[PDB]
Design a protein around this motif. Sequence first.
Motif, PDB file in Angstrom:
ATOM      1  N   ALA A 166     -19.487  35.315  72.946  1.00 18.24           N
ATOM      2  CA  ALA A 166     -20.132  34.789  74.293  1.00 18.24           C
ATOM      3  C   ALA A 166     -21.408  34.939  74.437  1.00 18.24           C
ATOM      4  CB  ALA A 166     -19.582  35.782  75.318  1.00 18.24           C
ATOM      5  N   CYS A 167     -22.173  35.768  73.484  1.00 18.88           N
ATOM      6  CA  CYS A 167     -23.727  35.948  73.810  1.00 18.88           C
ATOM      7  C   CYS A 167     -24.623  35.407  72.541  1.00 18.88           C
ATOM      8  CB  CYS A 167     -24.114  37.368  73.731  1.00 18.88           C
ATOM      9  SG  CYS A 167     -23.300  38.263  75.122  1.00 18.88           S
ATOM     10  N   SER A 168     -23.951  35.043  71.424  1.00 20.30           N
ATOM     11  CA  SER A 168     -24.630  34.616  70.109  1.00 20.30           C
ATOM     12  C   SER A 168     -24.129  33.397  69.427  1.00 20.30           C
ATOM     13  CB  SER A 168     -24.693  35.793  69.308  1.00 20.30           C
ATOM     14  OG  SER A 168     -24.749  35.635  67.713  1.00 20.30           O
ATOM     15  N   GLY A 169     -25.040  32.539  69.301  1.00 14.02           N
ATOM     16  CA  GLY A 169     -24.499  31.224  68.482  1.00 14.02           C
ATOM     17  C   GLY A 169     -24.109  31.457  67.014  1.00 14.02           C
ATOM     18  N   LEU A 170     -24.506  32.779  66.504  1.00 13.05           N
ATOM     19  CA  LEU A 170     -24.432  32.949  65.216  1.00 13.05           C
ATOM     20  C   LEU A 170     -22.854  33.743  65.261  1.00 13.05           C
ATOM     21  CD1 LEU A 170     -25.223  33.299  62.034  1.00 13.05           C
ATOM     22  CD2 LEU A 170     -25.776  35.796  62.520  1.00 13.05           C
ATOM     23  N   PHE A 171     -22.613  34.699  65.967  1.00  9.27           N
ATOM     24  CA  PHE A 171     -21.256  35.361  66.215  1.00  9.27           C
ATOM     25  C   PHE A 171     -20.226  34.376  66.353  1.00  9.27           C
ATOM     26  CE2 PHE A 171     -23.854  39.533  66.464  1.00  9.27           C
ATOM     27  CZ  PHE A 171     -23.286  39.614  65.043  1.00  9.27           C
ATOM     28  N   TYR A 172     -20.503  33.342  67.345  1.00 13.32           N
ATOM     29  CA  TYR A 172     -19.484  32.366  67.775  1.00 13.32           C
ATOM     30  C   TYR A 172     -19.087  31.538  66.485  1.00 13.32           C
ATOM     31  CZ  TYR A 172     -18.042  27.743  69.754  1.00 13.32           C
ATOM     32  OH  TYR A 172     -17.071  26.758  70.000  1.00 13.32           O
ATOM     33  N   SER A 173     -20.059  31.202  65.609  1.00 15.02           N
ATOM     34  CA  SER A 173     -19.733  30.410  64.479  1.00 15.02           C
ATOM     35  C   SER A 173     -18.886  31.197  63.449  1.00 15.02           C
ATOM     36  CB  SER A 173     -21.047  29.841  63.773  1.00 15.02           C
ATOM     37  OG  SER A 173     -21.636  28.699  64.519  1.00 15.02           O
ATOM     38  N   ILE A 174     -19.331  32.440  63.256  1.00 13.72           N
ATOM     39  CA  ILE A 174     -18.689  33.555  62.562  1.00 13.72           C
ATOM     40  C   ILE A 174     -17.104  33.582  62.810  1.00 13.72           C
ATOM     41  CG2 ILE A 174     -18.491  36.006  61.666  1.00 13.72           C
ATOM     42  CD1 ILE A 174     -21.594  35.942  61.928  1.00 13.72           C
ATOM     43  N   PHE A 175     -16.660  34.056  64.152  1.00 17.70           N
ATOM     44  CA  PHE A 175     -15.587  34.471  64.519  1.00 17.70           C
ATOM     45  C   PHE A 175     -14.652  33.358  64.741  1.00 17.70           C
ATOM     46  CE2 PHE A 175     -18.030  38.422  65.428  1.00 17.70           C
ATOM     47  CZ  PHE A 175     -17.727  39.134  64.245  1.00 17.70           C
ATOM     48  N   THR A 176     -15.256  32.065  64.896  1.00 17.18           N
ATOM     49  CA  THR A 176     -14.256  30.775  64.919  1.00 17.18           C
ATOM     50  C   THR A 176     -13.814  30.148  63.553  1.00 17.18           C
ATOM     51  OG1 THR A 176     -16.204  29.197  65.413  1.00 17.18           O
ATOM     52  CG2 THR A 176     -14.833  29.855  67.382  1.00 17.18           C
ATOM     53  N   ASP A 177     -14.488  30.917  62.699  1.00 14.29           N
ATOM     54  CA  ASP A 177     -14.156  30.878  61.214  1.00 14.29           C
ATOM     55  C   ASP A 177     -12.634  31.309  60.908  1.00 14.29           C
ATOM     56  OD1 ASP A 177     -14.908  29.619  58.380  1.00 14.29           O
ATOM     57  OD2 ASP A 177     -14.273  31.585  58.211  1.00 14.29           O
ATOM     58  N   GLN A 178     -11.978  30.245  60.582  1.00 11.78           N
ATOM     59  CA  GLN A 178     -10.528  30.856  60.127  1.00 11.78           C
ATOM     60  C   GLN A 178     -10.223  32.105  59.065  1.00 11.78           C
ATOM     61  N   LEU A 179     -11.314  32.198  58.390  1.00  8.87           N
ATOM     62  CA  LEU A 179     -11.102  33.531  57.470  1.00  8.87           C
ATOM     63  C   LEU A 179     -12.309  34.390  57.806  1.00  8.87           C
ATOM     64  CD1 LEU A 179     -11.730  32.287  53.768  1.00  8.87           C
ATOM     65  CD2 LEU A 179      -9.870  33.537  54.595  1.00  8.87           C
ATOM     66  N   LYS A 180     -12.925  34.121  58.337  1.00 12.00           N
ATOM     67  CA  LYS A 180     -14.315  35.403  59.044  1.00 12.00           C
ATOM     68  C   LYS A 180     -13.599  35.953  60.449  1.00 12.00           C
ATOM     69  CE  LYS A 180     -18.294  33.533  56.901  1.00 12.00           C
ATOM     70  NZ  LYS A 180     -17.715  32.067  56.637  1.00 12.00           N
ATOM     71  N   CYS A 181     -12.687  35.026  61.107  1.00 15.75           N
ATOM     72  CA  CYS A 181     -12.276  35.840  62.284  1.00 15.75           C
ATOM     73  C   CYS A 181     -11.441  37.017  62.167  1.00 15.75           C
ATOM     74  CB  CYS A 181     -11.572  34.708  63.113  1.00 15.75           C
ATOM     75  SG  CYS A 181      -9.788  34.053  62.084  1.00 15.75           S
ATOM     76  N   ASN A 182     -10.685  37.372  60.960  1.00 13.46           N
ATOM     77  CA  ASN A 182     -10.140  38.615  60.546  1.00 13.46           C
ATOM     78  C   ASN A 182     -10.644  39.782  59.880  1.00 13.46           C
ATOM     79  OD1 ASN A 182      -7.495  36.127  59.947  1.00 13.46           O
ATOM     80  ND2 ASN A 182      -7.565  37.403  61.730  1.00 13.46           N
ATOM     81  N   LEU A 183     -12.049  39.513  59.581  1.00 13.35           N
ATOM     82  CA  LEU A 183     -12.843  40.332  59.282  1.00 13.35           C
ATOM     83  C   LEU A 183     -12.939  41.655  60.130  1.00 13.35           C
ATOM     84  CD1 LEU A 183     -15.446  38.503  56.852  1.00 13.35           C
ATOM     85  CD2 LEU A 183     -13.386  39.776  56.211  1.00 13.35           C
ATOM     86  N   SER A 184     -12.990  42.900  59.795  1.00 12.11           N
ATOM     87  CA  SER A 184     -13.215  44.110  60.636  1.00 12.11           C
ATOM     88  C   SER A 184     -14.794  44.576  60.495  1.00 12.11           C
ATOM     89  CB  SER A 184     -12.412  45.352  60.593  1.00 12.11           C
ATOM     90  OG  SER A 184     -12.494  45.791  59.095  1.00 12.11           O
ATOM     91  N   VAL A 185     -15.596  44.083  59.212  1.00 14.17           N
ATOM     92  CA  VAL A 185     -16.944  44.443  58.926  1.00 14.17           C
ATOM     93  C   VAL A 185     -17.673  43.124  58.800  1.00 14.17           C
ATOM     94  CG1 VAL A 185     -18.246  45.912  57.603  1.00 14.17           C
ATOM     95  CG2 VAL A 185     -16.151  46.597  57.981  1.00 14.17           C
ATOM     96  N   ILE A 186     -18.867  43.218  59.306  1.00 18.33           N
ATOM     97  CA  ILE A 186     -19.782  42.118  59.293  1.00 18.33           C
ATOM     98  C   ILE A 186     -21.163  42.561  58.773  1.00 18.33           C
ATOM     99  CG2 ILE A 186     -21.033  39.763  60.265  1.00 18.33           C
ATOM    100  CD1 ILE A 186     -18.122  39.468  59.871  1.00 18.33           C
ATOM    101  N   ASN A 187     -21.662  42.247  57.722  1.00 17.77           N
ATOM    102  CA  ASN A 187     -22.864  42.613  57.108  1.00 17.77           C
ATOM    103  C   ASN A 187     -24.078  41.593  57.481  1.00 17.77           C
ATOM    104  OD1 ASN A 187     -21.723  44.932  55.471  1.00 17.77           O
ATOM    105  ND2 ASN A 187     -20.934  43.310  54.411  1.00 17.77           N
ATOM    106  N   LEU A 188     -25.046  42.001  58.218  1.00 14.47           N
ATOM    107  CA  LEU A 188     -26.210  41.174  58.474  1.00 14.47           C
ATOM    108  C   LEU A 188     -27.144  40.909  57.304  1.00 14.47           C
ATOM    109  CD1 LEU A 188     -26.839  41.725  62.353  1.00 14.47           C
ATOM    110  CD2 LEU A 188     -25.094  40.404  61.266  1.00 14.47           C
ATOM    111  N   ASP A 189     -27.947  39.947  57.165  1.00 21.77           N
ATOM    112  CA  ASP A 189     -29.115  39.657  56.523  1.00 21.77           C
ATOM    113  C   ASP A 189     -29.773  40.909  56.236  1.00 21.77           C
ATOM    114  OD1 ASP A 189     -31.896  38.681  55.661  1.00 21.77           O
ATOM    115  OD2 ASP A 189     -30.575  36.803  55.320  1.00 21.77           O
ATOM    116  N   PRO A 190     -30.163  41.568  55.007  1.00 19.66           N
ATOM    117  CA  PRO A 190     -31.025  42.624  54.950  1.00 19.66           C
ATOM    118  C   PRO A 190     -32.671  42.723  55.485  1.00 19.66           C
ATOM    119  CG  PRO A 190     -30.822  41.640  52.816  1.00 19.66           C
ATOM    120  CD  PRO A 190     -29.854  40.841  53.714  1.00 19.66           C
TER     121      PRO A 190
END
Lengths: 123, 123, 4, 4
Positions: A47-71
Amino acid sequence: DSCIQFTRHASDVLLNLNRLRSRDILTDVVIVVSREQFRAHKTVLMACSGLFYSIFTDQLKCNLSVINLDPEINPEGFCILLDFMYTSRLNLREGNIMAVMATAMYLQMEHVVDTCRKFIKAS
Amino acid sequence: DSCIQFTRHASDVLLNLNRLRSRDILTDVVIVVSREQFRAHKTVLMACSGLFYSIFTDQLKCNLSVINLDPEINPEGFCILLDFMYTSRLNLREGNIMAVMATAMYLQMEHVVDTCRKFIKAS
Amino acid sequence: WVIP
Amino acid sequence: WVIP
Ligand SMILES: CN(C)c1ncc(Cl)c(Nc2ccc3c(c2)CC(=O)N3)n1
Ligand SMILES: CN(C)c1ncc(Cl)c(Nc2ccc3c(c2)CC(=O)N3)n1
Ligand SMILES: [Cl-]
Ligand SMILES: [Cl-]
């Protein structure tokens, strides 16, 4: 329509979602930023981020319990932005504004990027 | 603190949560009301209702994907209240006000119960 | 409550 | 943006 509206409803909803975050209730993801870990609700992140919106609408990434951001992402910048997502309040300071703007550009939080650009232009 | 605040943030968050509901994205529960089924996000239901807050903080019920409401609950009254949860807008009409108030009392939505009592008192 |  |  002929609806009536409760002015404080959206603010009250967000306040309760932050209470759930603070008590770690129904959080369904951990965001890893360098060594630091942040628990959150996927729906609020989307709801707040275009990046997370893209990540969690992805059919594979929507099921991940851990997300690692760019170092390159600074944990403090992320923390300030996560707090903003759940409160509407941004802790913008001279010492953190560059890290906050860079994190907001990466997270695709257009309104935060806009106020950072304006505050930098003034100084 | 020395925070700045984005006035429209809470409203924008709620608008995006309703967009996710309308597309059935990350919904994690179905609320059964007589023959009718309503998909929703547990966190939004908890943020809006004292009844759902109690249900989903329970160590056993927090894991249920289906919740059956009391058979006395009217599906239309529930639908109007679920719409209010996600929009701040209440479709209160002469023909539905009794079912809406009874459903709001059951769901423990104090502000909705208050406006229903006031609208009934006026008539 | 208001008229939106 | 405002001063809350
Ligand atoms: C764009 N769209 C239909 C939509 N629906 C649901 C959600 Cl959760 C969503 N969130 C989102 C997307 C892009 C951006 C944001 C949230 C914030 C921002 O600055 N850009 N965006
Ligand atoms: C009361 N409390 C600490 C709290 N924290 C988190 C949530 Cl999600 C929550 N929601 C809730 C509880 C009671 C009521 C409502 C929401 C709406 C209402 O009229 N009563 N209440
Ligand atoms: Cl933003
Ligand atoms: Cl309410």
